């Protein structure tokens, strides 16, 4: 770990340090994944300068480790974020976000007639990477849309 905190962002003992989150996205992450709802000491750096990305974001979530899965879901938002396993002052394993078969709860359905919109039903979408984009198909209407569309609204 280079950890050049001459002034910017901490470093901890145990935990997970989601890094190289691109621009504004980080907030989205915390929001979508509710990484703020824990007793734990999260510590966020926003718009943290990095000439290699211009400005990036960092979420350090002390004494907390994300599963291969919890990591996977970040593929749509921060595809190139290196999740880090930290349990004794230094890196014990980095992680590259890999596209996952499904994306539950976080998304919404582009098709308004989807019964999903009114009932206590957590969204669920199968992911299919088809050239120049990613297709997402609702567990419900079974209607397939471009992730660009699923993300816009």
């Amino acid at each position: 770990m280079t950890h050049d905190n001459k002034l910017q962002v901490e470093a901890i003992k145990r935990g997970t340090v989601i890094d190289h989150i691109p621009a504004q996205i980080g907030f989205k992450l915390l929001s979508l994944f509710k990484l703020t709802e824990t007793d734990q000491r999260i510590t966020i750096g926003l718009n943290l300068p990095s000439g290699e990305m211009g400005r990036k974001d960092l979420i350090k979530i002390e004494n907390t480790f994300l599963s291969e899965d919890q990591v996977d879901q970040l593929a749509l938002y921060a595809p190139q974020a290196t999740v880090n396993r930290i349990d004794n002052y230094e890196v014990v394993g980095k992680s590259r976000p890999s596209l996952p078969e499904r994306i539950d709860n976080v998304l919404v359905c582009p098709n308004s007639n989807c019964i999903s919109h009114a009932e206590p039903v957590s969204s669920s979408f199968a992911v299919r990477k088809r050239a120049n984009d990613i297709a997402l198909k609702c567990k419900y209407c079974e209607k397939e849309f471009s992730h660009n569309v699923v993300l816009a609204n």
């Binding site: 098709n111 007639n113 989807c114 019964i115 206590p120 039903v121 567990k139 079974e142 209607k143």
Partner: protein, 310 residues
């Protein structure tokens, strides 16, 4: 334990080549030797939130021809359910506590499935969920073909009408797309074209399909002519009349058709098929309609009886 036991039939894309056969296979036996007391002591809730009298009566007759009791409804006037805001999830949770099977038609896509999440151990059957699915209908479509043509493999299927917004044909193509060497002829107006995904899905599994301007072009090579109804509204009432006449079957057009050639139509028909086509032996939509009773019976039989001693 038979495969289809205690399972919810929600999508056609849920059933395998094997399951389609088993369903078309059981129906054959029922149509031959009946089992009126098979489902005696059963109570299938027939819930039509989307009034579909035609579909309903068939399901309900299917039910009574297996000895089962029925309770249910239609539209949402004959229904006092979910007025100010009770949920469908709640309705199901209530209903799935007294009945043995739930057959429901809903106007919104994915309703059927959401119901499977709250029905507990009770099987849900989909009579239709909007533009999405309607397997029971396809099933019978498949049983009418298998029965008339003697095979579900190696066919020439012409699909005429409103291809883009027709929920039935989208389904038929995918089912037929599970059997070897089917070739497809899409005959539809520019505005009602078989939506690309399907077209993609065919191409991908090495399946032949072609676009034609008139049914006339292919009468000859055709085995099954599945016609659909163009709801004029999907076109301006003036746009409708121009291409309309290119897509309406008349007995004259029937002259060059194979012996076995059958014309199918989910119903109702309105203009796309001349009445003179009824007296022609290729007309089979009504016989198609009756086979709906066995397809549906077979299903109900499989989802509720651990072993089908048939």
């Amino acid at each position: 334990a038979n495969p289809l036991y205690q399972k919810h039939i929600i999508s056609i894309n849920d059933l395998s080549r094997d399951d389609l056969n088993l369903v078309l296979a059981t129906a054959a036996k029922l149509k031959a030797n009946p089992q009126p007391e098979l489902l005696k002591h059963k109570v299938i809730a027939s819930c039509f939130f989307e009034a579909s009298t035609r579909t309903r009566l068939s399901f309900e007759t299917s039910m009574h021809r297996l000895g089962a009791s029925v309770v249910g409804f239609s539209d949402s006037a004959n229904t006092s359910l979910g007025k100010k805001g009770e949920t469908l999830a709640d309705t199901i949770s209530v209903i799935s506590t007294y009945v043995d099977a739930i057959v429901m038609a809903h106007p919104q896509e994915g309703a059927a499935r959401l119901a499977t999440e709250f029905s507990g151990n009770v099987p849900v059957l989909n009579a239709g969920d909007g533009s999405n699915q309607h397997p029971t209908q396809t099933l019978l479509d498949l049983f009418t073909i298998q029965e008339t043509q003697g095979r579900l493999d190696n066919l020439h299927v012409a699909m005429v009408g409103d291809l883009k917004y027709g929920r039935t044909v989208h389904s038929l193509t995918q089912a037929l797309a599970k059997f070897d060497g089917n070739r497809f002829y899409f005959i539809a107006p520019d505005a009602l074209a078989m939506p690309q995904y399907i077209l993609d899905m065919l191409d991908e599994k090495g399946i032949a399909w072609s676009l034609h301007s008139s049914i006339e072009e292919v009468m000859a090579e055709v085995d099954i002519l599945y016609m659909t109804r163009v709801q004029k509204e999907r076109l301006d009432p003036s746009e409708y009349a121009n291409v309309k006449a290119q897509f309406v079957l008349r007995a004259s057009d029937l002259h060059n058709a194979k012996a076995n050639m059958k014309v199918l139509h989910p119903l109702p028909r309105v203009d796309e098929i001349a009445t003179d086509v009824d007296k022609t032996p290729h007309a089979w939509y009504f016989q198609q309609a009756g086979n709906g009773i066995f397809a549906r019976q077979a299903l109900l039989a499989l989802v509720l009886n651990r072993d089908l001693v048939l």
